[PDB]
Amino acid sequence: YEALAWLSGGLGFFVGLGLLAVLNDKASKVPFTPRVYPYDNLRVEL
Amino acid sequence: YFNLSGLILCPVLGSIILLFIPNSRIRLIRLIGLCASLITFLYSLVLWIQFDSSTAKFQFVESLRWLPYENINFYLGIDGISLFFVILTTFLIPICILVGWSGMRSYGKEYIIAFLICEFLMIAVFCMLDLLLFYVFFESVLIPMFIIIGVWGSRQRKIKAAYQFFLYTLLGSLFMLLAILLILFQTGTTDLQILLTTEFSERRQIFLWIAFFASFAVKVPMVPVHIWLPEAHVEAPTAGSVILAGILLKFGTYGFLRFSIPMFPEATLCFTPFIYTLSAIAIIYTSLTTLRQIDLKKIIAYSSVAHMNLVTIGMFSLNIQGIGGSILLMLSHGLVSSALFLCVGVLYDRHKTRLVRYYGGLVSTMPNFSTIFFFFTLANMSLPGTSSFIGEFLILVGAFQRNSLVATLAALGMILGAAYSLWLYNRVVSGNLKPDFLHKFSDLNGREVFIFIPFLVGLVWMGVYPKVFLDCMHTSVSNLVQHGKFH
Amino acid sequence: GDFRAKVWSMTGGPNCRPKHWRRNTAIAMFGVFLVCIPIAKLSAKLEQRPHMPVRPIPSQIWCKNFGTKDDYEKEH
Amino acid sequence: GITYKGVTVHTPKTWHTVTGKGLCAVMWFWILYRAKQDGPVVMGWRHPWDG
Amino acid sequence: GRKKGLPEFEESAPDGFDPENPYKDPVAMVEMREHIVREKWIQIEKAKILREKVKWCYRVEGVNHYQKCRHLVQQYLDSTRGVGWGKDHRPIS
Amino acid sequence: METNKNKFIEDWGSARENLEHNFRWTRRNFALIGIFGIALPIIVYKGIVKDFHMQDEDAGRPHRKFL
Amino acid sequence: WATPGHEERPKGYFMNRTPPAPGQSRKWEDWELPCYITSFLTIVILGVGLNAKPDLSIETWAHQKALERLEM
Amino acid sequence: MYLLIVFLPLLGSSVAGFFGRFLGSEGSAIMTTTCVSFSSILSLIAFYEVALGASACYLRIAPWISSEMFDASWGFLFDSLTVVMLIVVTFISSLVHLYSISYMSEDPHSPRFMCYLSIFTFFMLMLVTGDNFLQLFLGWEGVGLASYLLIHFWFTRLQADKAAIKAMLVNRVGDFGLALGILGCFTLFQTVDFSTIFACASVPRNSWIFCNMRLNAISLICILLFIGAVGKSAQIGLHTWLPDAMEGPTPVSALIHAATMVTAGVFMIARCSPLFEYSPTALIVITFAGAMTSFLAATTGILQNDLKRVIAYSTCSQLGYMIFACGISNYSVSVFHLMNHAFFKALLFLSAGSVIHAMSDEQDMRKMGGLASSFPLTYAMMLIGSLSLIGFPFLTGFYSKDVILELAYTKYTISGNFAFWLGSVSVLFTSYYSFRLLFLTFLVPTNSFGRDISRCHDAPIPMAIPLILLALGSLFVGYLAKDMMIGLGTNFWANSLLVLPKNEILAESEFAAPTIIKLIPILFSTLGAFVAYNVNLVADQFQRAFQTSTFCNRLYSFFNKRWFFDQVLNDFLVRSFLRFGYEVSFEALDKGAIEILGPYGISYTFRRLAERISQ
Ligand SMILES: CCCCCCCCCCCCCCCCCC(=O)O[C@@H](COC(=O)CCCCCCCCCCCCCCC)COP(=O)(O)OCC[N+](C)(C)C
Numbered sequence A: 001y002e003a004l005a006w007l008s009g010g011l012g013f014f015v016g017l018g019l020l021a022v023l024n025d026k027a028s029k030v031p032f033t034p035r036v037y038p039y040d041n042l043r044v045e046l
Numbered sequence B: 001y002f003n004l005s006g007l008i009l010c011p012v013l014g015s016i017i018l019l020f021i022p023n024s025r026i027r028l029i030r031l032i033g034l035c036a037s038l039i040t041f042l043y044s045l046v047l048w049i050q051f052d053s054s055t056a057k058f059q060f061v062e063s064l065r066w067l068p069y070e071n072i073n074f075y076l077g078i079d080g081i082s083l084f085f086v087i088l089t090t091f092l093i094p095i096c097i098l099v100g101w102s103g104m105r106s107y108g109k110e111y112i113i114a115f116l117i118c119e120f121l122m123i124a125v126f127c128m129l130d131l132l133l134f135y136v137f138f139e140s141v142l143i144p145m146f147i148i149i150g151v152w153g154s155r156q157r158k159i160k161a162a163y164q165f166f167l168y169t170l171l172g173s174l175f176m177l178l179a180i181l182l183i184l185f186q187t188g189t190t191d192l193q194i195l196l197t198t199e200f201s202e203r204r205q206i207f208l209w210i211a212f213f214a215s216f217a218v219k220v221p222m223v224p225v226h227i228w229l230p231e232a233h234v235e236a237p238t239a240g241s242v243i244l245a246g247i248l249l250k251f252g253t254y255g256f257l258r259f260s261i262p263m264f265p266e267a268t269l270c271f272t273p274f275i276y277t278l279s280a281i282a283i284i285y286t287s288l289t290t291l292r293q294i295d296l297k298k299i300i301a302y303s304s305v306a307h308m309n310l311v312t313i314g315m316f317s318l319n320i321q322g323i324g325g326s327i328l329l330m331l332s333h334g335l336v337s338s339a340l341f342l343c344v345g346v347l348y349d350r351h352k353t354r355l356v357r358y359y360g361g362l363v364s365t366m367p368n369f370s371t372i373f374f375f376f377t378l379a380n381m382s383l384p385g386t387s388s389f390i391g392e393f394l395i396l397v398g399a400f401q402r403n404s405l406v407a408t409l410a411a412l413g414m415i416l417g418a419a420y421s422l423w424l425y426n427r428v429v430s431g432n433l434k435p436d437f438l439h440k441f442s443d444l445n446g447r448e449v450f451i452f453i454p455f456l457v458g459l460v461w462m463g464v465y466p467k468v469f470l471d472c473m474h475t476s477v478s479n480l481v482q483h484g485k486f487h
Numbered sequence C: 001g002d003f004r005a006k007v008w009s010m011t012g013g014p015n016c017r018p019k020h021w022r023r024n025t026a027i028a029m030f031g032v033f034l035v036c037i038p039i040a041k042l043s044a045k046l047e048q049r050p051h052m053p054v055r056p057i058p059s060q061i062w063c064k065n066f067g068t069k070d071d072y073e074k075e076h
Numbered sequence D: 001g002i003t004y005k006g007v008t009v010h011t012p013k014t015w016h017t018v019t020g021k022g023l024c025a026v027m028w029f030w031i032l033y034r035a036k037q038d039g040p041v042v043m044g045w046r047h048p049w050d051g
Numbered sequence E: 001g002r003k004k005g006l007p008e009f010e011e012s013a014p015d016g017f018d019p020e021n022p023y024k025d026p027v028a029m030v031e032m033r034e035h036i037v038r039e040k041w042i043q044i045e046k047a048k049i050l051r052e053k054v055k056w057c058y059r060v061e062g063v064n065h066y067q068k069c070r071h072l073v074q075q076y077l078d079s080t081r082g083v084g085w086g087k088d089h090r091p092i093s
Numbered sequence F: 001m002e003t004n005k006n007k008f009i010e011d012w013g014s015a016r017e018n019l020e021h022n023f024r025w026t027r028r029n030f031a032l033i034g035i036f037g038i039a040l041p042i043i044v045y046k047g048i049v050k051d052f053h054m055q056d057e058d059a060g061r062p063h064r065k066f067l
Numbered sequence G: 001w002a003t004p005g006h007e008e009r010p011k012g013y014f015m016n017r018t019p020p021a022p023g024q025s026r027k028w029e030d031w032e033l034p035c036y037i038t039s040f041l042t043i044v045i046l047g048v049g050l051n052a053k054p055d056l057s058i059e060t061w062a063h064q065k066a067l068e069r070l071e072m
Numbered sequence H: 001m002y003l004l005i006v007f008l009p010l011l012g013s014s015v016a017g018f019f020g021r022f023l024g025s026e027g028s029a030i031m032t033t034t035c036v037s038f039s040s041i042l043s044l045i046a047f048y049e050v051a052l053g054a055s056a057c058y059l060r061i062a063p064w065i066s067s068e069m070f071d072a073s074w075g076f077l078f079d080s081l082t083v084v085m086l087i088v089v090t091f092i093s094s095l096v097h098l099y100s101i102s103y104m105s106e107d108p109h110s111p112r113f114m115c116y117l118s119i120f121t122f123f124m125l126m127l128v129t130g131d132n133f134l135q136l137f138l139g140w141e142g143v144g145l146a147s148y149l150l151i152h153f154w155f156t157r158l159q160a161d162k163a164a165i166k167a168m169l170v171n172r173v174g175d176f177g178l179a180l181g182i183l184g185c186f187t188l189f190q191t192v193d194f195s196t197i198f199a200c201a202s203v204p205r206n207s208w209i210f211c212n213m214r215l216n217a218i219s220l221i222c223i224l225l226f227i228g229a230v231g232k233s234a235q236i237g238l239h240t241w242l243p244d245a246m247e248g249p250t251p252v253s254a255l256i257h258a259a260t261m262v263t264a265g266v267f268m269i270a271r272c273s274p275l276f277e278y279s280p281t282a283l284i285v286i287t288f289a290g291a292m293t294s295f296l297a298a299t300t301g302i303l304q305n306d307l308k309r310v311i312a313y314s315t316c317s318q319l320g321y322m323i324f325a326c327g328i329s330n331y332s333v334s335v336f337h338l339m340n341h342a343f344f345k346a347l348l349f350l351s352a353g354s355v356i357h358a359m360s361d362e363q364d365m366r367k368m369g370g371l372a373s374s375f376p377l378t379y380a381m382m383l384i385g386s387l388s389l390i391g392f393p394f395l396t397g398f399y400s401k402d403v404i405l406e407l408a409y410t411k412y413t414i415s416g417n418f419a420f421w422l423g424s425v426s427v428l429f430t431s432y433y434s435f436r437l438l439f440l441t442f443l444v445p446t447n448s449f450g451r452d453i454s455r456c457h458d459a460p461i462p463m464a465i466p467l468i469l470l471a472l473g474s475l476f477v478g479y480l481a482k483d484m485m486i487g488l489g490t491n492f493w494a495n496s497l498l499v500l501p502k503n504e505i506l507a508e509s510e511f512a513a514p515t516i517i518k519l520i521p522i523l524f525s526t527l528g529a530f531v532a533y534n535v536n537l538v539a540d541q542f543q544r545a546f547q548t549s550t551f552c553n554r555l556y557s558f559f560n561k562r563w564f565f566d567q568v569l570n571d572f573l574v575r576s577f578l579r580f581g582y583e584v585s586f587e588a589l590d591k592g593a594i595e596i597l598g599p600y601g602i603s604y605t606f607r608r609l610a611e612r613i614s615q
């Protein structure tokens, strides 16, 4: 039974670290614009 | 010009000739029985070559009048579905004669007579097109298998196995017979072609379908009544244990594919979810039950139940994939279960244990049998390249065309099937030997090493190139699935 | 293996080391070569290779199908 | 070979130590040469003539 | 006897068949069923032919496969929409 | 060639074979038999029937009665 | 390698059948011929029968009719 | 020529296993090595004819299942991704066969080992060259079976039997996942062939009814394929079989538990690149699980004291980074890591096996001490392997192990920063244990017994040439392959990979990344090396052996027992199912209630009803 709590606790560390990544908001701090490609961003190629 | 009637008559001639000769000349009896079985097998193969797979109508038909009005008569005939069952039942009988070849002096001429009568009767079941007379031959196998189980069976519980086997095929059989009579009185004839093209009442198909399923849910090991197979199969002789799981379990499925799916199409749709639940719970429950077994026979008898239940999932999923995979897995099981039960029989006929814990670590002593057993339990796993995989995956594909829940449980069946199959393999062939009760024991002699060679070649031929088998049936399966489905 | 010398051991016993294995090895190589010749013949018979090579490869010495699939309309 | 007070070890083979030493030397040389050529490229000291 | 060749079958739809009362005429039922299944298999083989065509496309197409085989993709998918006895989409023939 | 078949095995083998004499409808085991005999079949039956119903809902066809 | 070895004959007996004395046949079993001839006939009839039979089916017929019909 | 590569191992194993008596204990081994060596030679020929001479060859033998548009065939797919995997698998198999002639020379069952590995090599060649799912599934289940067989090589080992059975359990869970994925492909595209799904995988955008809710097909299929590959790729779902599967022979743990089957799922997901690409939801869980495993294995592998077990966790960490590199839509970097790893990790296991063979199988780092000059060649071999494992700068390890983290930072999402953090952190633990292996063994005052020291017996010629070849590989293969697989737009993946224009962080990564991050893995590796030196050679009185009472020794048990997950999973699933397989069914079903009110339990009233009608 003691070993069970480690699995929940260990996964709790990861979701807790996963929650930290959510709070950090890495997505919106890009130093670059979205990529631009010729021919309407390759519309005929897609 | 080889017709269907000669195939039926060959076992009859072999049995009648065998009764003429006395019992003192035992060599003549066994020789003539094996010769008759083998020539019947060759005749069955010849019938395969001259089989038109393009047309949808039935092949060779022989009509022998039964009632004075020609109302109902013996209407023999094969199609894409019935041909392979005929080939399999002609192939299994010589194996049955060959396994007990050493003990023929102990059994006698009744043994071969019973087996040839079984071959005749089982051939007559699969290749006939009269619904009523098919019922007559359908439970006509009661007498010969009752004799086989009872006369040469267990020590003292042989009586109870015969009674349970005989009792389970009475109430459902006659409750089916009532529906047979209602169909006969309503339409007028029991000819299959006539009965297919009939407008049944919407409320009537429910009762008739239930009555048919009641007598097929006992032959196919469904959830309510499947406990007969383990007990009546352990308490059975090895040659009687190789056709009980090789042919009899096909009667229910074949009967579903002949007189249940076509005649009652919308009843099949209305009863589809119920069959799915029954088959899924059967698969799961049997899988969990079989992994804590110590009887050397039931351990694979439950595997047979699981495979037969998985068959119905795609058999009742109206689809070309589902039904084709159904018959392919049916033939694959008819081979693999037969091979497994022959392996159990040879293991039992040396040591006479009927347990699992006694055997252990015999790979250093019987390497040939070890390899053969590994290949058979490997086919039971449903490896691609083996017989079971193509059919069983086709069943999964066909059911997933219709439904997305139940056959996922069917696939979950194999997440434990393979596990306990290899675990069972590792009980016996692995570990250190225990020469405290295994003093002397030998390996397969020339007979039982050659007996598996047809099994090996048929298994690999199923696995690597099943196109020839699918070629002859795609017309019949497609005709079956589209019947009464105008749009 | 006191008793293990009595079993057939299809792939070889505990420590077989037969008296003449080198000749069996040589005949085994000869048989493998003889049986893989038809495999090579079949492989050279069926190989599409839709695109022509940029440089001459050790192929097209026994394979004659090169650039035979740039006609993807008459396909069955 | 020889024993100290009860433990004796076979002399390492000549064809093993020599190859080990030489191959270690040649991989060290390759590492140092790669450092000389493209060392500034991966450390940002200088770009591979692309700007 | 045999024609020792392809099994020629009548392309003409059988006569005497009425969708409102199919079960009235039993003798015409089986050939209509055979004709329907044969036509379904014709559609299946047409879909397989389109699949083979796109099969041979993808090898020659290269990186930019979308550009010059997009027209055949729709042709293959519309065939797969009315396929035989498949998923919940049952064709109405 | 027949095994020794020591006495301390057949008793347990028959106990596994003859377990039919040990059943007295105990309440905990009665709930255990009832749940796996009825509820799980009912739950799975609802699963398949609702899977069919949701499949038919998207296509827009009316639901089959499925008695 | 360079040494030839030992164990003049591989251990064990094939099929557990003891080898007969030199100059005598194997004394074929009473079912040996009837079943070997059965196997031989089955192998040959499957080899020459399943291949010399016409390739008539619904796959090839549908193939031909799909090729002929797709052109219009 | 091209059919030969896959059938030489199969035919050689078949003849060497059916007639192993004829060829003996050495002829079978040498002939299997010969067959696999020529298979590798034709693999190199195919690589030249396909990779450099870019023209994929396609050949079809005969339909396998000719049913209603389920035309699975025996056709073969030879693209750039196939050949680069072949030149790895067959080359490593041939060198392992050479290594095993001398390693498996004192053992009795020599031919059976050779035939097992040769049929396995045939199965994996069928996997790699397979044109459709069913053939790929065939090879995949075959390689799973053969892995089980090799774990079960010594049948008499009770522990090995259980380990093989558990490996079969997890592999069968993977079989469930991958079979469901494969069939789900057919219900959507009405095909299983690679060239049809890839050609038309973008058109459908419908949602299915998959048994609980409405889910998008492509996302569901990708998730199902991941659930299939978790067992094979050893991901977070089920990867407890690697450390427990080291009970088998070293060469198979050297050959296969480190090179290709562990990356078989990686190769499978890379092969179906234009199917995972259209489901951005899937790539999230791919990256999440990759980071999860790369952290789990690195953390669990730091306190292990077993020679053959500690490196399995390193292999699991490598699998984690490979999965992460797959989830970034940069599978070219993932396969680059694959080819780099297949050299040095196999080199590390082969050197460890050479050491363990000479020291009479004493795989406990508590024992071996300083006898490096006794084994200089193997020391150099494993030094090269471990330095490539570290990602030593300007070696075959640096060209992938740093680039993967660099690409990890350059993508900006929620899970991206998480995965980058885990990948950066795992470097410390990985370097720590990979250097503790070299410290506690051959670099500390000796603790091994005199009976093992006196044996000596340096590795002979047979198991030293493959070591030399792998050493010369994992020193220049990375440099010779960095330009020609990932050259910022090379023409090496015309049809093997589909690179999405949007998820294409390759050009912007090399230039917009800061210089500081491009060197921080080196600093982490040096810090790990210094920590290992401190705890293993200078400060080991308290940093190595702590006599703590509570809250600190439980930490020692936590990492050593692998977070106790090998016990929780057993007791909570396997034990539960083992108990409830009989407890409910065999007691309250089958014989029982269906019997007491059935045939003869209490419905046999006639016996009690017999003596009432004769009144
Ligand atoms: C659906 C099947 C698909 C194909 C699967 C093929 C996979 C191979 C299947 C057989 C694997 C071998 C397992 C045999 C049982 C293992 C234990 C055993 O009994 O081994 C035997 C035989 O050993 C063998 O493994 C030989 C069997 C052949 C193995 C090689 C198989 C090659 C052919 C199959 C693959 C061909 C290519 C694919 C075909 C299309 C004896 O071993 P010994 O070394 O002699 O030990 C001696 C015993 N004692 C110590 C007590 C004295």
Ligand SMILES: CCCCCCCCCCCCCCCCCCCC(=O)O[C@H](COC(=O)CCCCCCCCCCCCCC)COP(=O)(O)OCCN
Pocket: B084, B087, B088, B091, B331, B453, B454, B457, B458, B460, B461, B464, B465, B467, B468, G042, G043, G046, G047, G048, G050, G051, G052, G055
């Ligand atoms: C220990 C010694 C064993 C020796 C065995 C032979 C040695 C080889 C061992 C390898 C195993 C071979 C097993 C057979 C594999 C056949 C694979 C190819 C079959 C195939 O697809 O081609 C078919 C050939 O039919 C045929 O002719 C196949 C004939 C095979 C006969 C096998 C007899 C098995 C009998 C078992 C009965 C079980 C009954 C169960 C229902 C027709 O192909 P197609 O469609 O293109 O037509 C052609 C029209 N031009």
